Amino acid sequence: KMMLDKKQIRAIFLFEFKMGRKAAETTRNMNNAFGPGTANERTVQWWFKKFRKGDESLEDEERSGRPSEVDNDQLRAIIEADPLTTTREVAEEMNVNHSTVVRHLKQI
Amino acid sequence: KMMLDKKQIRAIFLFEFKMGRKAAETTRNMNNAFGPGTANERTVQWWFKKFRKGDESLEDEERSGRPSEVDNDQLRAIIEADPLTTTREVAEEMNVNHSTVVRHLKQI
DNA sequence: AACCGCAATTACTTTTGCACCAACCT
DNA sequence: GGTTGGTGCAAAAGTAATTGCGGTTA
DNA sequence: AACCGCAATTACTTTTGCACCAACCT
DNA sequence: GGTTGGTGCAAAAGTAATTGCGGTTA
């Protein structure tokens, strides 16, 4: 039955926060309306706390991801010193796979 | 202030319908919480009526779009009778632009 | 007070024409 | 140079959503 | 009864290695 | 044949969301 995205769930939290409900009250309303396990009290309090500060964005904060192992300036210098060089030759010197070279050359 | 998608708005309608609210009641709750012009009574009744039948999908029904002016079987036959023929030659015979021929040849 | 039929208006859908293009051909 | 398949994007051609007014049921 | 700090767990993010490939080269 | 740039996708390496338990304020 329950087909809602995280964004749709969070919009209902925001609606409920703006109606003046307490988070524990909103939790009960959501489990009654959509069924058990729709909302957790602690999660609703975590969101209400963000809303109460004026942060009404329903998105996650940005995640930087895996740190890059390639220095684009070094790659630029290796290419400028030898423009003939293949991706497999650059990869051996840079201790990466040639596909990482291919992908980073598209960036620069 | 108001940043919600149609899908987020519709999820709030569904929540409210499942809480046992009347559509005119939900309309007032949404305009009070998010501000004037957030919801219209007639629209909320149109959605509640779909929900009441058991249709709890928050998507629009599919739209077929512009009707196609090209017969793919004819295009297949023109190509099979003369494989040498260019998109501009096929377009002249089919009363379309060559780009429609290009696009429809990708389909088949 | 609430909902709904109806119809006018708005927003979406997919497809097409024209302008313009780069790679390949002549 | 010319030819060719291909794409960006506005206009086109459709269906379904949006919603104000008046009727009907409460 | 409700919220929150804290920490364990889960879900997401972007990047990389390896397997495998088709077009072009030798 | 071999070489080459390129992609699919699983594994990797990160940050932030999710949430149960115990403390604190009511």
Numbering used by the authors:
A (entry chain A), B (entry chain A): 330 to 437
What does the paper say about this structure?
One DNA transposon, Hsmar1, was active in primates from about 50 to 37 million years ago and gave rise to SETMAR (or Metnase), a fusion protein found only in simian (anthropoid) primates with an N-terminal SET domain and C-terminal Hsmar1-derived (MAR) transposase. SETMAR comprises three structural domains, a SET domain, a transposase-derived DBD, and a catalytic domain. The first is retention of ancestral sequence-specific TIR-DNA-binding activity, mediated by the DNA-binding domain (DBD) of the transposase, although the ability to perform TIR-specific DNA cleavage events has been lost. The second SETMAR function is lysine methyltransferase (KMT) activity, which is contained within the SET domain.
To provide a structural basis for recognition of TIR-DNA by SETMAR, we used a selenomethionine (SeMet) phasing strategy to determine the crystal structure of the SETMAR DBD comprising residues 329 to 440 complexed to a 25-mer DNA derived from the Hsmar1 TIR at 2.37 Å resolution. Thus as previously reported, a phasing strategy was devised in which strategic Met substitutions (I359M) (L423M) within two predicated alpha helical elements were introduced; these Met substitutions were critical for phasing. The C381R substitution was introduced to prevent disulfide bond formation. The structure of the complex is dimeric with two DBDs, each bound to a TIR-DNA duplex oriented in parallel to one another; the DBD comprises two helix–turn–helix (HTH) motifs connected by a 17 amino acid residue linker (residues 384–400) containing two AT hook elements bound to the 25-mer TIR DNA duplex. A relatively large surface area (1610 Å2) involving interactions of F344, F363, and I341 in each HTH1 motif is buried in the dimer interface. Sequence-specific recognition of the 19 bp TIR element (5′-GGTGCAAAAGTAATTGCGG) is mediated by 32 hydrogen-bonding interactions, nine in the major groove (two in HTH1 and seven in HTH2), five in the minor groove from the AT-hook elements within the linker, and 18 with the phosphodiester backbone. Within HTH1, the larger of the two HTH motifs, a single residue, R371 in recognition helix α3, forms two nucleobase-specific hydrogen bonds with G5 (B chain). From HTH2, S428 and R432 of recognition helix α6 hydrogen bond to C18 and G17 (B chain) and G8 and C9 (C chain); R417 and H427 hydrogen bond to G5 and G6 (C chain), respectively. Within the central AT-rich regions of the TIR, R392 and R395 act as two AT hooks forming specific hydrogen bonds to nucleobases in the minor groove. Individual substitution of Ala for R371, S428, or R432 located in the recognition helices in FL SETMAR resulted in significant decreases in affinity with relative KD values for binding of WT, R371A, S428A, and R432A to TIR DNA of 42 ± 5, 521 ± 65, 485 ± 58, and 302 ± 47 nM, respectively.
